[PDB]
Design a protein around this ligand. Structure first.
Ligand code: A1IR6
Ligand code: A1IR6
Ligand code: MG
Ligand code: MG
Lengths: 600, 601
């Protein structure tokens, strides 16, 4: 039949565990296995990786395992596996990553119905509160109209139409040690006019963190990358974006706190390379596309003023925006938050800007202020561009999502004299179903964070609270617990992944009902928000008081939510019991610690 | 004519701790022929007693005497007291030390005011204060304020031996009891002792080193014995009410706060029942009227046996603190000025709130608990003008803490939102480091600055902190001073180059280094530094020829000069016949700079 997707996996001394997880993620795919193929190419492993791949391919007719040499200096397994691929779309999956169980089906149906050459699906990384925060915000079947920006982040973990790659001969550069090999690949795809679509409503690829250092090798590659942009990108809008994006992130990105973390010898090497790269490759008009703080860095870089840049890094050290929980409560079937934040230095004293004449200036010493153009430390034009947004991250899937529907407001307040602070307030609600897309997501801890940007600073940090916060809810067969974790950060347990809803709700101990004839023991929950109907099956353990090593007597239990009240019913069944017993409930794998004792 | 008698009971003493004790007594400014050492070993099983017989071989005024084993150190203190012949007695433990000017300052203070008990300033290893209220000023007639003048009731005071033996004031010789030093001090005041507080000099260092009492039944059996001692022996009504109010709040109600969140239900149920039984039997009702709102709440819930509501209030009050942020720090004239701010929060995060219902500011409580309490106990209206906001300092070496006088502070109850009110404080103060330099060793020491905030029944004494990087140097009348955000994010003041190099932190005007044609004097001006008054600090420099890898360095004398509001390092070469380019590393007060200074000669 017609192969819809080809999975390209290059391998070399692959960890067996990560390879097992990779094969499991492919087997979990909702797409019929005869509609995709797996193309593995071993790069001459010194371990038994190729022997394990053959054992995998025995029971999988859609799997192909090829073994080459050590790439012969100038050869790449991804190109070799591409020439033998037969599918309509190709995914370049690394040997220690995984793929979500509905990726193939969702990605293919999206690319087919929009005739896409590149499908850029939502990507997930182990660490961080976001990835592709701007691009993975909504589905865009005609993303290539945005310009070359639609392909960011330019990982090789997209779905490329095999017909498009072979026609334009888009391969991976056959250099043994080329960095950002995927940036060349994605840029070449767009230069040849690829129809690009962004699939954002479902996480498609998990880039797992497993884990350059040579400043000469690093800056040799940075020069090679900018020379690629200037020589190949012919559309002005696209070229200006790549020049601006990589000059800000990689070139100016060493002129900040990087100066405070490296010795003066390494600083001299990279700063001299950066200044040489700015003057030769980066046009002056790129400065127009930068924010005020990056314009200051760009100006001092070309001036060779490394001394003023080091002082500026010390002055800027620790600027951040941390959000405190002002209120948190369940209402109907949602969890509501009210937060507050302000720009500070390390969550301590406020960050200030100064008002001189009708200008809102960056607070700087006069010695540095005289060295800079007057407009570069004036924030007057940017005091209405603040963003304040909430986000959520699943602790198991590592997938991050923006929490939609929030209302926020950021004010520039005159605290004293001519000094102004930046304060924000936000209120949002979380409908947990908006982020449950796989069955595995139903039972998972969730972590809440806030993203605050303004005046050139991006501050995306976990939501925090100081007071003790533990609030439970039972909403339409979903057990939900919002709590301050041991790090003072806000977490949301759904499905009893880490906490016990009976233990955190409490037990009206003096209201336990023992129905001896029906054999039912009713244990009502104390503090808990109950909405809708709920019946969660579980079990419980009875143990006679006094007998040390008594076997637990296993009985059926169920957590019930009805009429805005929660209770656990324990059914004694055919058990013949007499005396005092310990009663421990076991709902969703979590045992309470309420020390319940009943007399039968 | 012996002036001071020192009593030291020893038992299995650490070899290093006992050695440091003898050094603190030998370095006393008082003439050694005016004080004696009376050691009494309480039946040591190790070789501790054999070490004392070695210390007494060289010192003539040191006596050693081993006595039958008795457990606690009250028997050796009683037997050493009878065999003493000094006018004043100091009970010194085998793990503590004494400051050099203690004997001279204490004796003059006690004899010029005819004092029976001299309560000198005591220093502990940890904490930002000790005796904050009592050790604030000198008071030659402190017994007029009541038994309060003897707090803290440690045995590390100076009691006139004439007064002790005449009134038969001894330590309990029987089974080991807790707070036996409280018995001793109280018995001394009951007999009408003229107490004097010497607060201007640290007299004693109670060193935190590294036992019965963990048992709750044993713990609360001791608390009952101490309370019965107060009701039976203290005759003055004012002095009895104080001792009852002080100890019922600290040790009885003290387990009804955050202590409930640190123990299991079983230990809590045992100690809570003891506390409820003791408050009903020994603590009259009129004592609770002398307590703050939060303690009146705990007192009411204790007698009602409502441990469930006390556990819930502990979780509501957990984390209430007040951390001070640096708003401004600068040197001016000969002092270091600070502007700080603070507000009550939960663990330096969200604000702490009190709510306004009708015309009364109330503690924010759940309705289930608020309906169980009298309305007056959660009404903070009468207490909104009783906030305090003060600064304090602590020497990292001497461990001594001091209130920083002359501060200006204001605390506000501000309507943040709706009917919720926060508590904000602003404070400005200055530091005169010569106020806290009393011994020669204090001239080279790191100093840590803290702030103390009290209000609504909460006390928060924490180190001053700052987020932004802060480094500012000064050269003030031969004192090198560096205020800075330390590695822990707290405010520290280095004096005498104990941790940081003033040349390194000030900066060098490299393009203004002068080399005289004939004199051969190298002048290195400092960039950013506050210079006030004349200064001259003798140091040295190091020279290495540029190029030669492992060339032997050239050590030469240098000096840091403060003059005309400018600092500079003058490197006097002289006899050193040198030519070519050389590296120059200054070394002022044992701290070398990293300015990469090169000169050509
Ligand atoms: O928005 P955000 O705040 O979520 O930021 C996260 C990303 O969306 C943002 O950093 C994005 O603009 C970065 O994407 P690009 O610039 O295309 O960089 C491409 C590189 O990631 C690509 O070469 C990687 O494969 C290199 O991997 P490595 O790690 O170098 O090792
Ligand atoms: N990781 C340390 C590197 C620091 C480099 C050199 C040290 O000079 P620094 O002043 O900059 O650093 C000072 C900080 O480390 C500071 O937090 C710490 O060292 C102070 O030492 P300590 O007397 O125990 O302080 C104890 C007192 O604060 C006392 O109040 C505590 O015991 C209370 O509990
Ligand atoms: Mg990986
Ligand atoms: Mg804070």
């Amino acid at each position: 039949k017609d192969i819809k997707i080809s999975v390209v996996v290059p391998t070399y001394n692959t960890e067996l565990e990560g390879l097992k997880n990779l094969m499991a993620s492919i087997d979990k795919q909702t797409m019929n296995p005869d509609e995709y193929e797996l193309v593995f190419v071993d790069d001459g492993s010194t371990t038994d990786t190729y022997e394990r791949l053959q054992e995998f391919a025995e029971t999988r007719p859609n799997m192909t395992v090829k073994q080459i040499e050590n790439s012969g200096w100038g050869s790449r397994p991804r190109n070799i596996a591409t020439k033998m691929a037969k599918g309509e779309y190709i995914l370049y999956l690394d040997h220690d990553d995984t793929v979500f169980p509905e990726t193939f089906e969702r990605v293919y149906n999206f690319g087919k119905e929009n005739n896409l050459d590149v499908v850029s699906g939502k990507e997930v990384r182990t660490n961080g509160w976001s990835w592709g925060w701007k691009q993975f915000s909504e589905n865009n079947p005609h993303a290539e109209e945005m310009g070359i920006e639609c392909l960011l982040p330019m990982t090789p973990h997209k779905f490329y139409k095999r017909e498009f790659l072979l026609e334009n001969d888009i391969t991976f550069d056959d250099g043994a040690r080329v960095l950002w090999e995927d940036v060349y690949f994605n840029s070449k795809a767009f230069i040849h006019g690829a129809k690009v679509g962004i699939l954002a409503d479902y996480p498609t690829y998990y880039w797992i963190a497993t884990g350059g250092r040579d400043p000469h090798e690093k800056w040799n590659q940075i020069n090679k990358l900018f020379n690629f942009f200037k020589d190949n990108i012919k559309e002005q809008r696209d070229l200006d974006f790549m020049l601006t994006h990589w000059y800000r992130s990689r070139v100016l990105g060493i002129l900040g706190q990087w100066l405070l973390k490296n010795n003066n010898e390494r600083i001299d090497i990279e700063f001299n390379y950066a200044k040489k790269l700015a003057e030769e490759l980066i046009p002056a008009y790129i400065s127009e596309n930068l924010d005020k703080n990056n314009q200051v860095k760009d100006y001092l870089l070309r001036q060779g003023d490394l001394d003023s840049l080091k002082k500026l890094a010390q002055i800027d050290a620790g600027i951040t925006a941390l959000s405190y929980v002002e209120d948190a409560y369940f209402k109907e079937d949602k969890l509501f938050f009210k937060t507050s934040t302000k720009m500070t230095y390390e969550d301590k004293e406020d960050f200030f800007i100064e008002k001189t004449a009708d200008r809102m200036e960056r607070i700087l010493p006069e010695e540095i202020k005289s060295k800079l153009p007057k407009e570069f430390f004036d924030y007057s034009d940017d005091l209405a561009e603040f963003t304040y947004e909430p986000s959520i991250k699943g602790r198991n899937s590592r997938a991050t999502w923006k929490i939609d529907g929030s209302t926020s407001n950021v004010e520039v307040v005159n605290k004293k004299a001519n000094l102004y602070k930046i304060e924000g307030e936000m209120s949002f609600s979380v409908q947990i179903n908006d982020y449950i897309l796989d069955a595995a997501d139903k039972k998972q801890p969730w972590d809440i964070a806030t993203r605050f940007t303004g005046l050139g600073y991006t501050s995306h940090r976990a939501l925090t609270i100081g007071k003790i916060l533990i609030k439970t809810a039972l909403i339409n067969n979903k057990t939900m617990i919002v709590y301050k974790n041991a790090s003072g950060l806000i977490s949301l347990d759904v499905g009893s992944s880490v906490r016990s809803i009976v233990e955190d709700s409490g037990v009206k101990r003096e209201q336990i009902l023992i129905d001896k004839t029906s054999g039912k023991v009713t244990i009502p929950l104390n503090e808990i928000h109950v909405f809708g109907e709920s019946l969660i099956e579980g079990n419980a353990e009875l143990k006679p008081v006094g007998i040390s090593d008594a076997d637990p007597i296993n009985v059926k239990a169920k957590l019930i939510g009805e009429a805005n009240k929660a209770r656990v019913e324990v059914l004694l069944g055919d058990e013949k019991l007499s005396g005092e017993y310990h009663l421990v409930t076991n709902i969703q794998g979590k045992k309470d610690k309420q020390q319940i004792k009943i007399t039968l």
